[PDB]
Copies of this chain bind each other. A is one copy, B any other.
């Protein structure tokens, strides 16, 4: 349960330091195990929990979101990969467009289908451009993307400027979960130079030095999974960001 608005929470943090978010996949473990992962990451210094996977079991995301809501005090932010990934127990939702998908369903179609449910639940919705970078991982394939090549910083900055002009105040550079190498520092730095978006970067950020370089390159938010204890992994990532 997080009363305050997540977006102002983000701005409060950013006047002193960078934000870390921990991504939890609801299928990958029980709600109770999710609570334990989340507590470990909070003891590691994480600033919030992103919740999202690939599930249509509505009760199952809800059981995780509700369990987290009753046991942690940092925001629960929905990060949906399907349209059913909206839960009333969460504090906010990254309402994103998959910008470099060639499939209209991932650009706007899923969003139109889910919009009414987001409105009726009254959950704070943060507008986000979502850009998959090479290699792109599972989301780059399932979302029918053309991953931005690592050597094309200019493509990423043009989509960010475009996305910002359309009103997406958050921008997410995604190398894909498990990516061997994280989003290049060259591309993070050019994007941050070109827009005033809250700049989010995820994928392949494993070590404290990975996080120092992503943070040093201009990322406002760093996103990581919990593959490794979990507390040590997160705290070392948080220390690298500092």
Contacts and interface: CB of A to CB of B under 8 A. Distances in A.
**Chain A interface residue number, banded:** 35 or more
B144 A104 contact: yes
Interface stretch (A119-127, A207-215, A223-231): A119-127
Contact of A142 (B61, B87, B95, B155): B155
Copies in the complex: 6
A83 to B, nearest CB: 4
A105 B108 contact: no
A139 to B, nearest CB: 11
A104 B125 CA distance: 24
A4 to B, nearest CB: 19
A22 interface: no
Interface of A: 27, 54-59, 61-62, 82-88, 95-97, 99-121, 125, 127-128, 135, 138, 141-142, 144, 146, 148-149, 152, 154-155, 157-159, 161-169, 194
B108 A159 contact: yes
B58 A117 contact: yes
Given A57-B117, A58-B61, A116-B157, 7 more contacts: A56-B84, A57-B86, A82-B113, A112-B158, A114-B162, A125-B165, A127-B165
B58 A95 contact: no
A62 B157 CA distance: 26
Contacts of A95: 165-166
